Every structure is written in structure tokens, then in C-alpha cells.
Design an enzyme around this catalytic site. Structure first.
Site, PDB file in Angstrom:
ATOM      1  N   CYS A 203      40.449  30.298  23.353  1.00 14.68           N
ATOM      2  CA  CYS A 203      39.803  29.648  24.389  1.00 14.68           C
ATOM      3  C   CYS A 203      39.294  28.836  23.528  1.00 14.68           C
ATOM      4  O   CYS A 203      38.929  29.282  22.781  1.00 14.68           O
ATOM      5  CB  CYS A 203      38.745  31.522  24.500  1.00 14.68           C
ATOM      6  SG  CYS A 203      37.153  30.542  26.369  1.00 14.68           S
TER       7      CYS A 203
ATOM      8  N   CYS B  46      53.097  61.673  58.948  1.00 13.84           N
ATOM      9  CA  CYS B  46      52.405  60.991  57.488  1.00 13.84           C
ATOM     10  C   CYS B  46      51.131  60.161  58.142  1.00 13.84           C
ATOM     11  O   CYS B  46      51.280  59.484  59.313  1.00 13.84           O
ATOM     12  CB  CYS B  46      53.126  60.408  56.383  1.00 13.84           C
ATOM     13  SG  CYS B  46      52.881  59.582  54.858  1.00 13.84           S
TER      14      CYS B  46
END
Ligand code: ARG
Length: 706
Positions: free
Chosen positions: A631, A268
Site C-alpha cells: 500500500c 423443502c
């Protein structure tokens, strides 16, 4: 191994919507045309390499028919390898093998960092020259290879003395015992199966174990040889030395396939180069729970893998942590990457465990403030508010302080710490604005261009909704494609979507959706929970670009996607002119919009909707800052009115454009521009909407002027 034509396999792979492999990416028409009749020197074909991808869409990589596949089908494999291993300019290269000076090499024991490591393991693989892989071996050559290898293993001295167990003839009792001790491999991987890994099973295969059971070898499981050193605890030094010694000894007997581009060849492509995977099984539940856990690991050169199925129901938080790199460095570089990164991660777990002692359950855990302050150093102290006001004296004052319900200063700078282009923090609850006033108040003053006043923030001043000082900013054809006004709102009593618990979210959603389902008239609509949504509703939401995804890194690292997608949803009326997003960044974003430029009608619908929702809950509000939001950039009115504006002319004299925006306090984002009021705090809602209107009216009358 007999497989379909390469052209057939390409069509199968391409026609498969589930397939997103690199094989699919690079197996182009030109590649098929070039290689469909080509054979390697061992007689293998590209079809044999990509066959498993046709049947296993989850597989990312091809395999290789034999070791010559990488050279024979190079245009394909180099592309795949460069992509997977993130090789800069496709400049694939690999250094000579170097395990280091074994006699003097020493790593700290990994259990030094909190005693979290169950076991430590290092693995490598080798291809023996002259033999194919699964698809190209014969029954006889696989057995010849096995014999060659077991003979080499029989010749390892002292420490490595042990027993070879050929799979063939192994009793089922030994099979059961060996798999129970996790020494034995099985034919249970369908990707391996369809790449030719189990041909002539179980012949030509076996395992080798030394007497101390800390050295284990797999023969022909996938690679020709897979060598594994392992033991309980964190002794990486011994594990690695034991591994290095053995493969060096085996090298005297076996010729292994290596070239200066890919290093050691493997079946692989993911295991090329060093082939080395050094790892620990570690208990890191708190670190694992961070929103950017994966990114944190990758940034320390570490790849994490879950171990679910390997432990009891109530013990997770155990992960496999290994070097992320295989190709383009030495073995010594790789095990050093592992040790350094794992050490940092375990030290971070220890810090998390200590910094969050006593904190509410379900509330987001956070790294120590001083740790996050170091990450934040990458932010510009000139543009980043979050950093600018994080002074030594502020750190000293607030380190280890929590709000009544568990919010910290560390919580609120985290988004900036991990995203240095983010300029504002994200708070954990309304109380943050008094508990951490020394940090937040100068920051707010700076951002909004204001200063400390003796007076309470103006009450909500929406105006007379029947006699507004604005109407239709564009009755005619088109300067204005559409108009929109929104506000943020927080609900009293709840932690913000950054740190709030899953139960918090569920209760929040019950409060809010209850109100929304009761809205009437123009505001009547349907709530679509992100958790329990009908798929057609889901599709249509995406179609309308009414999105609510967990894909913003800033919000993510503030914690806004935790326990996804519980308690999140979208509400709108049938006309889609009144909408509410539930629990994204703020508890609510309440939105009014429509085609055309009739701001008075959008504004009116918005105000009436806010009031209706407000009947069922108290909005968090401050004498100092007006409406409270997650915020600090969105305090005061929390109001953004905007238009989609077509100004082809003016956008081409762009600084008598960016000068209107400046002097009329507007923001522009791209001859079609989205124009909005910039101000949020220090003005009323009515003024906010009027500023936008006056600014847009100017722009439009400027536009006809050109
Ligand atoms: N030695 C291996 N099993 N390699 C397979 C790695 C898995 C690979 N990234 C895939 O999805 O194809």
C-alpha cells in the site's frame, strides 16, 4: 413416520456443535412449548419437520411433514423462510404465477458469450393438493398420488410424448442405464432419508421421459412432481418454453398447492415461490478463480455450484450457474434474472481470458482496467485517492501495460473497485512505483502531503540506540497500558502478496523463515506456519489475539488471500514482545511491543530485529519513496509507533483532543485510546517515533491538567 419427541430433537440439535442450521436458530423453547402437541390437518408434527436436522448437522433448513406444515407451525417456518430467502421485514409475499408471453418471449443464446455453455436446464416442482409428504403419506396414498400424476403425464400431447418408468419392478439394467443417462434418482441422500423421503421405497415413485429426451419428470422423489427441461448448448429460450408449456398443460389435470404468501408449496423451504431453478453448466475457470467469485455471482443475481466429480481431473472450471431467487418474483422475473446475470458472468469470463492473455502462470488474473474503473465510480472522487487520480488520460496511457513481472494498474485499483470505501490502491510489486509513476506519484504526494523533490529519500535513520530522544513515557502507574512500534518490509525480487504466485509464496517463506529461525537473544523465537501448525499452537495464537485470518474484504479483493494459507505464518519470541507476520499484506510486518510505556526499549528491540532480519535479504527501497510497501500509504519509514492510552478526562473534551492529534500529527482510535503517529513518509524513523512520544507526552500532561 415415527420420530422422537420435539423436545428431544431440540436438545439434540442445540447440543450439536456442528449444527448451525436455521432450524437450530428458530426452534426456541417457546416454539417447542407452543407446538409440541400440535398436528397438521394431515396429521403431521413439527418433530417430523425438524427430525432430519437432529441427525444431519450440515443441513441448513427443516423440511415439511406435509403442505399444511407452513400454516400449522407458522411462527417457526415464517421465521426460517424470511431468514433464508432474505425477506426484508419478514414481509413474505409472492405474486401470481407468470411465465410470460410465451409466443413473443425470446432470450439470446447463452453461447453467444464465448461459447462456454455445455448445457442449459430449467427445473420446477409442484405439490398436489390433498396429499402429504414423506412423513404423512401412507403406502397407498403415495401410490394413488403416483397414479394421479402418471395419468396426467399420459395426457400430454405431441412434444411431450414419451414413457413412464415406475421404479418398482424396474430391472437393475434399466436402473443402471437410466442413472448413467442421469434420468434416474436414487435413495442416496441422508438428509432426505431422515426427513422421511424413502419410506416404502421404491413404491409410489417413478420417472417420465419424452422421446426427444429433453423433458424429464420425477414422481415422489422428494416433491410430488419435479419437472426438468434440458438440452446441450445455450438455448435457454426453448428449454424454458418447453418447461412452461408442460406445467401449464399439467395444471389442467392437477390441482397444485399455492398461496399468496409462499407461492407454490414444496417439501423443502428453499424451493418455495416459483420453485424455479434455471441454470447452465458453464466453463468459467478464470472467473471462478477470482477471490470474490461468489460475491461477484451473487451481485449479478446468480448462485454458483461446483461440479467436481462430474468431470476429468484436468478439466475443472465448469460450474452450475442459476438464478439465486425463488420467492417474491414471477417465473419470468426468475429466468430473466438468470439470463441477465449468467450473460454478464460469461461476458466477464471472456474479458478475463482476453485481458490476461500472456500473463505469468500463477499470477492473479484481473478484469479489464476500464471494467474496474466503472465499478470504482461508486467511490467518492473526493475521499478516494484510488479514483481521484484514475483520470481518462491515465487510463488511456496505462491500459494494457504490465510491469516486467506482470503487475497491472487494474490489479492495483481492484480492491477499491469492489470496496468503494477503500481509499488507497494495493500495488503488485516494487516496479509498480516506476512503471505507473504517473498514477502513483501524485497520489502519494496527495496522501502524505508532500511533493516531488530532487533529493534521494533519507537513508534509514534509526538513530543512536543507546542515546535515544525518548525513554519511558509513563514510568508511574497508568496512562499507558502498552507500547508498540512496527514496520512494513518488502523483499527484493518478489511479487507482492496481492498477485504473487503460490510458488512465489513458498519461496518467500523459505527465505524469511530461514532468517527468523536464526534470530538470537531477545529475538530468538518460533515460526508458526499457517500451513503446518500444531493445533495447541493454533489455539494459543487465537487466545493471544495473534490472528491471521482471510476475512478482510479489501485485502481479499486485492488478492491477498489467494492460495490460502500457503507461505503465511506468525513468528514471535517467547515473551511475545517481538513478532513478525509473514506475507499478509506486505511480505513482512515486523513488530515490537510490551506492557507499559517504555518506548525506548520497544524501539530498540524493533530496530535490532529489523537489522538482524536484513542480514539475510535485501529490503525493497526507493530513492523517491524510501521503503517500498504494497500500500502506498505505508511508504518511507513504513513505521507506526503507538500506545494504548488511558485518558478518561481528555476523551470527554474530544476536540481539544482531536486538535492535539491534528497539530501533533497523531491518529486516535477508540477513556482508552490507541494513539499513533500519522506520518510515514517525509521524515526519519527517529522523528516518527519522537513525534508519537512528544504527542503522547503532551496528551498525558494535558490529562492531569483536567
Ligand atoms: N429440495 C431440496 N433438496 N432442498 C434442500 C435445500 C438444502 C437446504 N438449503 C438445506 O441445507 O437444508
Amino acid at each position: 413416520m415415527q420420530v422422537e419427541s420435539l423436545q428431544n430433537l431440540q436438545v439434540k440439535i442445540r447440543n450439536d456443535e456442528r449444527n448451525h442450521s436455521l432450524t437450530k436458530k428458530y426452534l426456541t423453547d417457546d416454539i417447542v412449548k407452543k407446538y409440541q402437541a400440535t398436528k397438521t390437518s394431515l396429521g403431521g408434527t413439527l418433530a417430523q419437520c425438524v427430525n432430519t436436522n437432529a441427525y444431519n448437522p450440515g443441513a441448513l433448513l427443516p423440511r415439511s411433514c406435509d403442505l399444511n406444515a407452513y400454516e400449522t407451525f407458522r411462527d417457526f417456518f415464517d421465521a426460517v423462510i424470511a431468514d433464508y430467502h432474505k425477506v426484508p421485514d419478514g414481509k413474505i409475499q409472492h405474486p401470481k404465477s407468470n411465465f410470460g408471453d410465451l409466443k413473443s418471449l425470446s432470450f439470446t443464446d447463452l453461447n453467444t458469450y464465448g461459447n462456454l455453455v455445455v448445457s442449459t436446464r430449467v427445473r420446477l416442482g409442484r405439490t398436489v393438493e390433498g396429499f402429504g409428504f414423506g412423513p404423512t403419506l401412507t403406502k397407498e396414498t403415495r401410490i394413488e398420488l403416483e397414479n394421479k400424476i402418471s395419468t396426467a403425464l399420459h395426457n400430454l400431447s405431441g412434444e411431450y410424448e414419451g414413457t413412464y418408468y415406475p421404479l418398482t419392478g424396474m430391472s437393475e439394467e434399466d436402473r443402471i442405464k437410466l442413472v448413467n443417462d442421469h434420468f434416474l434418482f436414487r435413495n442416496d441422500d441422508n438428509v432426505l432419508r431422515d426427513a422421511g423421503g424413502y419410506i416404502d421405497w421404491p413404491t409410489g415413485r417413478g420417472i417420465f421421459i419424452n422421446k426427444q429426451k429433453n423433458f424429464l419428470v420425477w414422481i415422489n422423489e422428494e416433491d410430488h412432481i419435479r419437472v426438468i427441461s434440458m438440452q446441450k448448448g445455450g438455448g435457454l429460450t426453448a428449454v424454458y418454453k418447453r418447461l412452461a408449456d408442460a406445467i401449464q398443460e399439467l395444471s389442467k389435470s392437477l390441482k397444485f398447492a399455492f398461496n399468496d404468501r409462499l407461492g407454490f408449496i414444496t417439501f423443502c423451504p428453499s424451493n418455495l415461490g416459483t420453485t424455479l431453478r434455471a441454470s447452465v453448466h458453464a466453463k468459467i475457470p478464470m472467473l471462478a478463480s477470482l477471490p470474490n467469485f461468489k460475491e461477484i455471482c451473487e451481485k449479478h443475481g446468480i448462485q454458483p455450484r461446483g461440479t467436481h466429480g462430474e468431470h476429468t481431473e484436468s478439466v475443472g472450471g465448469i460450474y452450475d450457474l442459476s438464478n439465486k431467487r425463488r420467492l417474491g418474483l414471477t417465473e419470468l422475473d426468475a429466468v430473466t434474472e438468470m439470463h441477465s446475470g449468467v450473460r454478464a458472468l460469461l461476458e466477464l469470463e471472456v474479458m478475463l481470458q482476453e485481458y490476461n492473455k500472456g500473463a505469468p502462470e500463477g499470477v492473479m488474473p484481473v478484469e479489464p482496467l476500464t471494467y474496474l474503473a466503472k465499478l470504482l465510480e461508486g467511490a467518492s472522487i473526493e475521499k478516494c485517492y484510488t479514483r481521484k487520480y484514475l483520470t481518462p488520460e491515465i487510463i488511456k496511457k496505462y491500459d494494457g501495460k504490465r510491469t516486467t513481472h506482470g503487475a497491472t494498474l487494474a490489479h492495483m485499483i481492484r480492491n477499491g473497485a469492489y470496496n468503494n470505501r477503500s481509499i488507497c490502491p494495493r500495488t503488485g510489486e516494487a516496479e509498480c512505483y516506476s512503471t505507473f509513476i504517473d498514477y502513483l506519484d501524485p497520489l502519494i504526494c496527495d496522501y502524505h502531503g508532500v511533493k516531488d523533490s530532487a533529493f534521494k529519500h533519507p537513508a534509514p535513520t534509526f538513530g543512536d540506540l543507546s542515546k535515544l530522544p525518548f525513554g519511558d513515557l509513563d514510568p508511574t502507574g497508568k496512562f499507558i497500558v502498552s507500547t508498540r512500534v512496527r514496520v512494513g518490509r518488502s523483499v527484493e525480487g518478489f511479487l507482492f502478496p496481492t498477485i504473487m504466485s503460490k510458488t512465489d509464496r513458498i519461496k518467500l517463506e523459505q527465505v524469511i523463515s530461514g532468517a527468523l529461525k536464526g534470530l538470537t537473544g531477545e529475538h530468538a523465537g518460533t515460526y508458526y506456519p499457517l500451513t503446518d501448525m500444531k493445533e495447541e499452537d493454533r489455539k494459543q495464537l487465537v487466545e493471544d489475539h495473534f490472528l491471521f485470518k482471510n476475512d478482510d474484504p479489501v485485502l481479499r479483493d486485492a488478492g491477498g488471500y489467494r492460495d490460502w494459507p500457503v507461505g503465511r505464518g506468525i513468528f514471535h519470541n517467547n515473551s511475545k514482545t517481538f513478532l513478525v507476520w509473514v506475507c499478509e499484506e506486505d511480505h513482512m510486518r515486523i513488530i515490537s511491543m510490551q506492557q507499559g510505556g517504555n518506548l525506548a526499549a520497544v524501539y530498540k528491540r524493533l530496530i535490532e530485529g529489523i537489522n538482524a532480519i536484513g542480514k539475510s535479504m535485501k529490503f525493497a527501497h526507493s530513492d523517491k519513496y524510501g521503503y517500498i510497501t504494497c500500500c502506498p500509504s505505508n511508504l518511507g519509514t513504513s513505521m507506526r509507533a503507538s500506545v494504548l492510552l488511558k485518558i478518561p478526562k481528555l476523551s470527554s473534551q474530544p476536540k481539544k483532543l482531536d486538535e492535539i492529534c491534528a497539530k501533533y500529527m497523531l491518529q486516535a482510535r477508540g477513556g482508552t485510546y490507541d494513539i499513533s503517529n500519522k506520518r510515514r513518509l517525509g521524515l526519519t524513523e527517529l522523528q516518527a517515533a519522537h513525534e508519537m512520544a512528544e504527542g503522547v507526552a503532551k496528551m498525558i500532561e494535558i490529562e492531569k491538567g483536567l
